[PDB]
Ligand binder design. Structure first.
Ligand SMILES: C[C@@](Cc1c[nH]c2ccccc12)(NC(=O)Nc1ccc([N+](=O)[O-])cc1)C(=O)NCC1(c2ccccn2)CCCCC1
Length: 392
């Protein structure tokens, strides 16, 4: 009575959720990216699992008589789901860290995971009255169940956790910076102008001491040094001056106060060409230091070769790009936490199923635990789209 009602309710909820998910993907394929395609693959896998797990239970409940392909399809479904979760976590890591023909590559990766799943579900058809009983009559069931646990639960979630460790680390470093580049500034936002004279004067007589200055800053300020290194790398790449300056400032302002103080310093330098006094004041916070101040003054002079109207457009573009990059990072972390919710619900719902299936290899509230575990397995697919609906 209670069990059939709750089972039908959750089955309907999950089927409707996955159908709505895939239908939304079909309708709005015009807005579909790596994450959208991967959650589409997840929805397809979950829906196939539902459609192949309903009939066996229905036949075993409302009948007593009923084998080589259904378990293959079910294992294919679970493999597709979990490996697409892994690929989605990898996408989140590669999109959050590195950007602090692609879509076709994601599509062929989806094809690849489908194919490797249907190839890894081949052994199922080997060993699967009128009751389709795969379990024959010691080591084969346990070994197969452990293999399914490893291939389908353990290493995929392990990869997801590994690639979220370096999504937490990146944000922790970005938080350490800003706080460090705002407490005792003018070591930053001045060396950031001694990292542009190096770009301007390409002679090795500048970079030879610029590398040493970066090493000293790292010995004295880690976040400042990493921001300066990213700034100079971007500036050198985009130089081949204004583009180099924009790239350097953008890379530096990536781990709120820094943009404001830098805009103020640029405005002050716009009318200094007594610039030496301002450079000395900025660098107040050792002949190598004098040479670095000279290079910073060179970069300030280069910036001075810009009209009042021209510099305003430059600072406006720079601050707009800073804001856009911050917003994109926030959106990326929001999608990362949504996928983390997906992984959490998946583990909470599929750990009981996996542990019970590993235990059942021994036996090749028992009924109530079995039915609640199956309802939980379906509830995973129930709450994936519910999580995406509520969180987004
Ligand atoms: C799909 C089926 C049952 C099945 C076997 N026939 C059928 C005919 C019709 C409908 C269903 C079946 N498949 C095997 O159990 N296959 C197997 C059995 C014994 C041995 N052995 O003894 O070595 C080796 C392999 C199975 O419960 N998956 C195990 C899992 C699962 C549970 C619920 C829903 C989906 N997925 C899939 C992920 C790992 C743990 C749970």
């Amino acid at each position: 009575c209670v069990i059939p009602s709750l089972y039908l309710l959750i089955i309907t909820v999950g089927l409707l959720g996955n159908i709505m998910l895939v239908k939304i993907f079909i309708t709005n394929s015009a807005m579909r990216s790596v994450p959208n395609i991967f959650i589409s693959n997840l929805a397809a896998g979950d829906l196939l699992l539902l459609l192949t797990c309903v009939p066996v239970d229905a036949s075993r409940y409302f009948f007593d008589e009923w084998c080589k392909l259904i378990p293959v399809i079910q294992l294919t479904s679970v493999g597709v789901s979990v490996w697409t979760l892994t690929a989605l976590s990898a996408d989140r890591y590669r999109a959050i860290v590195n950007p602090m023909g692609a879509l076709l590559r994601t599509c062929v990766k989806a094809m690849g995971i489908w194919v490797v799943s249907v190839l890894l579900a081949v052994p199922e058809a080997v060993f699967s009255f009128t009751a389709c009983i795969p379990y024959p009559q010691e080591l084969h069931p346990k070994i197969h169940s452990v293999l399914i646990f490893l291939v389908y639960f353990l290493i995929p979630l392990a990869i997801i956790s590994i690639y979220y460790y370096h999504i937490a680390k990146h944000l922790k470093e970005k938080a350490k910076a800003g706080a460090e580049i705002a407490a005792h500034p003018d070591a930053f936002l001045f060396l950031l102008f001694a990292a542009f004279g190096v770009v301007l004067t390409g002679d090795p007589e500048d970079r030879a001491l610029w590398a040493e200055l970066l090493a000293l800053v790292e010995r004295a300020a880690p976040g400042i040094a990493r921001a300066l290194a990213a700034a100079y790398r971007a500036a050198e790449e985009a130089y081949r001056p204004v583009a180099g300056f924009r790239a350097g400032i953008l890379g530096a302002c990536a781990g709120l106060p820094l943009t404001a103080r830098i805009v103020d310093l640029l405005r002050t330098i716009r009318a200094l060409r007594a610039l030496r006094a301002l450079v000395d004041a900025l660098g107040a916070e050792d002949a190598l230091l004098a040479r670095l101040a000279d290079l910073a003054l060179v970069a300030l002079r280069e910036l001075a070769k810009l009209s009042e109207s021209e510099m305003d457009a430059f600072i406006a573009d720079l601050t707009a790009a800073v804001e856009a990059m911050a917003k994109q990072m926030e959106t990326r972390k929001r999608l990362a936490k949504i996928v983390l919710v997906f992984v959490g619900c998946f583990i909470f719902c599929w750990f009981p199923n996996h542990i019970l299936y590993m235990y059942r290899s021994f036996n090749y509230g028992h009924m109530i635990v079995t039915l609640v575990a199956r309802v939980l397995s379906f509830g995973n697919s129930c709450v994936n789209p519910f999580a995406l609906y509520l969180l987004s």
